[PDB]
Ligand binder design. Sequence first.
Ligand SMILES: Nc1ncnc2c1ncn2[C@@H]1O[C@H](COP(=O)(O)OP(=O)(O)OP(=O)(O)O)[C@@H](O)[C@H]1O
Ligand SMILES: Nc1ncnc2c1ncn2[C@@H]1O[C@H](COP(=O)(O)OP(=O)(O)OP(=O)(O)O)[C@@H](O)[C@H]1O
Ligand SMILES: [Cl-]
Ligand SMILES: [Cl-]
Lengths: 390, 390
Amino acid sequence: SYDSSSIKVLKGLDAVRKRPGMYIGDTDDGTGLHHMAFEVVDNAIDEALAGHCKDIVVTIHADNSVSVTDDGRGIPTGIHPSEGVSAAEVIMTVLHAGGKFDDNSYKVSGGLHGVGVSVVNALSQKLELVIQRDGKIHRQIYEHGVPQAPLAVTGDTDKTGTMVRFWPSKSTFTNVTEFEYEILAKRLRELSFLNSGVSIRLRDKRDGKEDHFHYEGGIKAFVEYLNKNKTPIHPNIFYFSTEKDGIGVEVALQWNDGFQENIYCFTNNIPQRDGGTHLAGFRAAMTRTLNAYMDKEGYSKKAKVSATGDDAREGLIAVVSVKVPDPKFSSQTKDKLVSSEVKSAVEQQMNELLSEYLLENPSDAKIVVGKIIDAARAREAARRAREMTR
Amino acid sequence: SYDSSSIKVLKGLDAVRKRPGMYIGDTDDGTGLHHMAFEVVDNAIDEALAGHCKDIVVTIHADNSVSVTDDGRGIPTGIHPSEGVSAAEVIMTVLHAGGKFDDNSYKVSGGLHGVGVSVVNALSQKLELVIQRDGKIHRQIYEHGVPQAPLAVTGDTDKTGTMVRFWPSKSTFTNVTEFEYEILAKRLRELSFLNSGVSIRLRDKRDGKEDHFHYEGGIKAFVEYLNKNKTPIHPNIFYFSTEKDGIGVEVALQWNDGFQENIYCFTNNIPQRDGGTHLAGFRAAMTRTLNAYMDKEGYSKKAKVSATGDDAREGLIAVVSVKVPDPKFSSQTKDKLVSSEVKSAVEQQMNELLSEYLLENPSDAKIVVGKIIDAARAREAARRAREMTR
Ligand SMILES: Nc1ncnc2c1ncn2[C@@H]1O[C@H](COP(=O)(O)OP(=O)(O)OP(=O)(O)O)[C@@H](O)[C@H]1O
Ligand SMILES: Nc1ncnc2c1ncn2[C@@H]1O[C@H](COP(=O)(O)OP(=O)(O)OP(=O)(O)O)[C@@H](O)[C@H]1O
Ligand SMILES: [Cl-]
Ligand SMILES: [Cl-]
């Protein structure tokens, strides 16, 4: 019964169709379905990070396919010297294949696994690829990840870029099978905030809805946008952008009247829903700096006796965006940043620049200290009241 | 600059060494390092789920290597008809290779990707494999995932099983590089609770510390163990074990005096730290059943006016353990169960059996209702007290 013949080797993209949970995620609640679009978008954003793409158009078609057009360099079209087919076909049909295993093509990229669009292809009943590169238009069609013919020159062009349109496999995706405008818009808005000078257009051909994301203000405007329907309690958004020992750190924050903590973390524009070394550095610095400031200004009595890290973060909105040549995550999902050097990179910058901010904006600083004290008092009233019910 | 020659294909286990975050996880905080041991253990547990292994020995050696010995069937030793080397070498050296892509060798298995021990091998500067199978002892040594010679017969035996000892690569693992007794013990204890009749031994050859996990009581004893140092508020642990439409559902729960909710979810013995369809079914049923009971017993006035799902779960300890022929997760980490059929499987069983439990144990039922009401009152006192500080 259990012998050498029980041992099965999945080849090509078969492994992706066998276990889509491993590659695209939840194939049932819609998160995976939208992640098919995000893999293609993230590849275009990487062209932008590299300085080669200023213009991205995402289109929800009336047949529930999605296309992503960029004006970046184009997916390489040349025959791959080892694989014997176009570099484009290698990218589409081979796991762990791409230009983000070194710093030669992208200095900084959210991509690192070499599986993103090979996974989109595998789980798409159809993919259309159109490449503008080296004065030529290249076209290729895939069905369930199988190329219908070699990548072929169809025209001349003086432009560069990539168009991928994919029809998600109805065999793979279940329950939530239709693209939701607002799920795509949330991520493209945030990418606009993170990539000033990149025009991102979202077009819905089902109902003619259109958006053009080209936000003024970067992550400063991002924090203003996030605090819109909260009541910001101080007018000076804390902001900085630094680069040291090859690490980009960009931070913006502002407190509001509410009781939530919302710190949005990013590595090469990829969100970390479970934080990591950038959040850990941000937190250490915020605590050290606020505690140092409160001690120096004599306000420490409450902070010294009770006020803690948690109560600093009550009503906090912040964006922490880092640029890392070779990031490490805790998993394939890239939801937690592991790169240990990023923690001191964020921590030393925040320590210096948040200290300066509090000296340069004493009105803001007194309001934030007020906020910290009020959050401690509420926390202690609540603990006391739970005890009294017993 | 950016052309077909920029496109690199990682072959064999190179992809695992290039991006260990994708395969083993955090290579810096120790979680990944311990996960190397858990991949090998989980493979032995799968032999147990299949009915073929009653005995597992995990050993921390004084050189910081780890071995896992099972008395299961043995890794197949026969030449693989396609790959041309031993099935064992295929398992060790090929991603997406194994016997858990169908229900022929394991009816139910935590394994499903075919990468677990191929990843351990890749990130081990040395791995020793010893297989007892078909009356023969088979031995093979790997260095950095490269076999030093073909799997070779070295002896006769009337026994079956697998021994893997691995020396983690000092190039891959950083900061936390030493195995922690207690991290391994926590998981082997829980596996003992989940697998009655499987003897699990943990041996530390650094200090001679030994444990033998062969717990009496299954997940009932698991819940008793978890409530030890809390104050259980009712003596009748709710418990059931069912099998319907090919899904095993096993639940045990008991309330304590504390304010935490702790629901430990498992699929084929793999933990879901982020829950999924089993937790969602458990929650729906618990809410429907408690609400139905409170309404019928007339206690509903508080529950109807205020008491909510959250306050049911305050002071709750529970274990939800499901057995699923072909599970689907939201990611490679297997931390969230996606299989949608599991939600109604857990929900219908809990609805019926928790209803019966509350009718059959009216003293417990009145205490749990008391608990639910008290948690609402504390929640409302706390909200009120936060408002009054403003
Ligand atoms: N829009 C694009 N323009 C140019 N090159 C692209 C584009 N999309 C993909 N590529 C190339 O194809 C390669 C493979 O992309 P794929 O998404 O499969 O993996 P990756 O982006 O390298 O990593 P990840 O799996 O983390 O996304 C990229 O590394 C890049 O070299
Ligand atoms: N201790 C063992 N005894 C018997 N067969 C084993 C043992 N360990 C591994 N195998 C075999 O080797 C195969 C490959 O194991 P591996 O851990 O690489 O992947 P998997 O267990 O199939 O899935 P996953 O990647 O989710 O762990 C298993 O499917 C099984 O057939
Ligand atoms: Cl065999
Ligand atoms: Cl090229």
